Symmetry: C3
Subunit: 340 residues, 3 copies
Amino acid sequence: AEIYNKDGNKVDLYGKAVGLHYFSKGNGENSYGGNGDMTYARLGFKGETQINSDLTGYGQWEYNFQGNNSEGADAQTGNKTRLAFAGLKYADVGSFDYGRNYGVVYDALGYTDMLPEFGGDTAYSDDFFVGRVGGVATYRNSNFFGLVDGLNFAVQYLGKNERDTARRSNGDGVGGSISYEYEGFGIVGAYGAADRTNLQEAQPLGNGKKAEQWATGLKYDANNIYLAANYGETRNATPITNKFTNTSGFANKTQDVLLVAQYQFDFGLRPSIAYTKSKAKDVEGIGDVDLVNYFEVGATYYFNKNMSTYVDYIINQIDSDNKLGVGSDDTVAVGIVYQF
Amino acid sequence: AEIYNKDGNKVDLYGKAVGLHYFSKGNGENSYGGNGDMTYARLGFKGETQINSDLTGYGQWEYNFQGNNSEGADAQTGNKTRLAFAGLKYADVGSFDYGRNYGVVYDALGYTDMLPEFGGDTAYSDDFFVGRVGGVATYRNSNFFGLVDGLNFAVQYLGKNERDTARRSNGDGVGGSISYEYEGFGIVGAYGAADRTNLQEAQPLGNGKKAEQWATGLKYDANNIYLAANYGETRNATPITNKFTNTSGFANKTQDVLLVAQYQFDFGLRPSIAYTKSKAKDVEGIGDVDLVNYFEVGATYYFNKNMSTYVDYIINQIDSDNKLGVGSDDTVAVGIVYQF
Amino acid sequence: AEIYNKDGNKVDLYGKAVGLHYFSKGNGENSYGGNGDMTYARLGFKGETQINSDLTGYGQWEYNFQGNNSEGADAQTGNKTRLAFAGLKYADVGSFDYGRNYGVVYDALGYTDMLPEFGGDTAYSDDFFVGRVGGVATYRNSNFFGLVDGLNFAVQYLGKNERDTARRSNGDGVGGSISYEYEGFGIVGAYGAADRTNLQEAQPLGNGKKAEQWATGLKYDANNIYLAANYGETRNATPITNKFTNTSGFANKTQDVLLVAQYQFDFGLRPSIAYTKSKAKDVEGIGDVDLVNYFEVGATYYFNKNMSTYVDYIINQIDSDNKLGVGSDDTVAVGIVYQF
Ligand SMILES: CCCCCCCC/C=C/CCCCCCCC(=O)OC[C@H](O)CO
Ligand SMILES: CCCCCCCC/C=C/CCCCCCCC(=O)OC[C@H](O)CO
Ligand SMILES: CCCCCCCC/C=C/CCCCCCCC(=O)OC[C@H](O)CO
Ligand SMILES: CCCCCCCC/C=C\CCCCCCCC(=O)OC[C@H](O)CO
Ligand SMILES: CCCCCCCC/C=C\CCCCCCCC(=O)OC[C@H](O)CO
Ligand SMILES: CCCCCCCC/C=C\CCCCCCCC(=O)OC[C@H](O)CO
């Protein structure tokens, strides 16, 4: 919501209250997404300032607050700052910003990240370029300097984060993306490579001094029709773990595939069907394993831009022989979102 | 404060800065409410959206930030999300919402929760229906479908929360309330029952597979006069603990009584006297014990709707033989609230 | 940003998104300020209410959110409530407020706290009167009751905080400040003394039952010129630690000196040079040690009141023989701030 707009500075304060529950068999512990209360809320601000006719400054922060913890010792569980960056935009030169932000490969992966609740499984946070990460400097160019409508590109420097856990760490890295869009049709490619920390290399899963990710996507998006596909691969980048005695690390390689179909009726209903498969390969002591394998069926109903409800059923194709212990049961999310 | 109201959506951003100190003998550790700095602040939003002539959507979030922690390792202590829910309201049918919210029995207990600082002792958070809890679906009806001014009712489903601690856990449960109000007089009843988790049943205090709570209240509230009484009982629901070697659990039964009297002068002063007694019964290895026993004397002075100050003296009737180690000393809160 | 102003109540919601990185040799662990991502964001509110012609009420809260943690187990690291207080201001009598707030000696120390990123080294948080602390009641007087333009003074009661750590604890204490300002020239003095907790006295560094701090400062500030000096001393107040086997405590005495020079060009650039030295004395098992010794060179460029960038190079004069293990390498901060 734009709550402030005076003297060339505007501030959008935004957020939402998601009442949300997951239904899964027994424990949920061997299901796709777990079981129980999942209610949370978001809060954030974007600001933009007109510096002059061509120059623009901006900053943005967004925070997650779980609503399914007690007021006791677990109050903070799942609470995090999702985004925090500032930058500048100049006329037809492009934008530069720095802070915690989405990695370039997410420009690709965003194509199928459209399910009511789930999906976008390959866009892990703090995982190099595939989702939100700390310490990205990002340059982006719009319509190729104003010369070429619908063509964009970005380049990114991700600095190293030697965190406590191998899972959240990364070395210095470089990435980019290009996308073209014409009359509801778009295509995208993105690639990034980065060094692994010593602590990542120390883990029993994953071997090698460079993590790599790339993804391509192709989409149809107009006339109330949404269709999109993603195919990606990774090397040494996808976090994996055993379920029982935690040995963790990274997948030596993965193959990712995301298919999405959705239709937007004028009265507000939007059915959605989607299929997602992700498989690891050359995992040590395992060989090949599926990490994600499912079909999805569900629907969102928009009352208006502020209020919605949705159902998301995950038909989980993993099965309980899975060598990594990936849970095999299904999951339904029912939810109700107010947002401003 | 209503900071946004455009195009059928309105957003109230609200909060407060409470400067607050507790005075108690020596340590405070054997007093009613402790001793030292107690300063905190709240932040929150309510939103409401006109979907059509009869249908309304809303969401709400509210957070607590302690102001009496350092900027070091204890920064987060006492910090929690208090409320997070969304729902819908239809014309004369009622409202439905889901998320973290107040339990129905709090519709009763709210009658005496009016002291400057203390009181409302029986409305524990994360304690089934008596205060704030995660995972309530709540339906409410206003003036009985518009047919009956002043008569309300609600029904609630509380889903299970198998938390880490017995104290914060609960099984699935069902509750309700009815209230009638006529010319400053009101009466209320509320009841809820729920299953206990296995981890609640594992504790040395508390015996039984169902927690129960109910409460009734009767009040006078007009012409600057506030008077209200509450009588309630619980089974297996009231959290209790030893002071010295923590054995915890729940009270096999309790009897609760809350009496409140207050007067609102036109210049802004509002004296308040109140008495509260809560006693446990059939506690294992104890028998009967008082949990709460005190008289209260105090006053709030309202400068206006945004600014106030108050004193709350607790004359603590517990005494230092108390078999559970409930502290026996008195406590005074002096405070200063700005709120927007 | 003033987002609300209706009916005698106004609320300024404010904050910022700092994209920020530190450059230092190797680890950073033996540098002045470390090494890596340092991005963070602030959020806060000030409110003010016209109670009548002379009486004014206010409250304020401000929070820090790090943007350089993951979304995993370290999400909360460095997150804290910085300020939370409320009070009242009466006509020409002065203001009284209570909560978490700046200690009086910070009225002095604020003179040299002007570097782009660093500086203000002696204004530790939760350190009696030198920075932010919990439980201050503060009275302040403006222009000496309206009688004397440019002359101010304050008096402060800091109540005890028996925290878990000696570092964050304090006894009851009393402080004050006076300042005079005439045509861009100002001078300030401030002093505070307080009792130490038993847990502070238990530490191997620091000896004595009273912590003391005082500081004086003298400044020039007009015609785009900023110049200011600070000289201060402490007894039993400055937190010190070994680097390798943590023995901690307080410095038996310190001598502080801060010099600052800055120039504000009309186009927006503001170079800054500054020098800071702080040395401990009578430290047990050490004798004398420098805690801070450096020169600073840097610059901020203001695009406007909302958007800036800066560089701050610390030429670190500590050297790697330092008996306490204070890091000896240099540090450069490059940053980009959006603020509203
Ligand atoms: C198998 C891996 C495949 C990876 C897929 C990466 C896709 C990246 C997009 C490239 C667009 C290349 C140029 C396309 C745009 C041409 C310019 C144009 O369309 O318009 C000209 C007009 O003059 C302007 O208004
Ligand atoms: C000992 C335990 C006691 C528990 C206490 C529970 C109290 C619940 C209230 C019930 C109200 C019952 C109906 C009262 C309202 C009657 C309708 C009325 O008052 O008004 C009629 C008029 O036509 C409309 O405008
Ligand atoms: C070595 C330690 C030194 C510590 C340094 C502490 C400085 C504190 C300031 C004191 C000002 C004393 C009074 C100065 C103001 C005099 C009044 C005046 O200037 O103006 C008169 C006029 O009538 C009004 O409008
Ligand atoms: C007065 C104008 C001042 C100048 C305005 C500057 C704008 C700064 C913006 C973002 C910082 C981006 C920093 C990205 C740093 C990554 C470096 C890294 O990751 O490690 C590198 C290695 O140590 C070898 O230096
Ligand atoms: C397109 C329209 C989609 C439909 C819109 C739905 C609105 C959902 C609102 C709240 C969820 C309430 C969930 C309450 C669940 C409690 C269940 C429980 O606690 O456990 C039950 C047990 O496992 C046996 O299922
Ligand atoms: C109806 C009007 C009600 C009255 C309005 C009151 C305004 C209160 C404001 C701030 C509290 C400041 C408290 C500062 C307390 C510090 C005391 C301390 O630190 O310890 C002292 C020792 O225990 C010996 O009491």
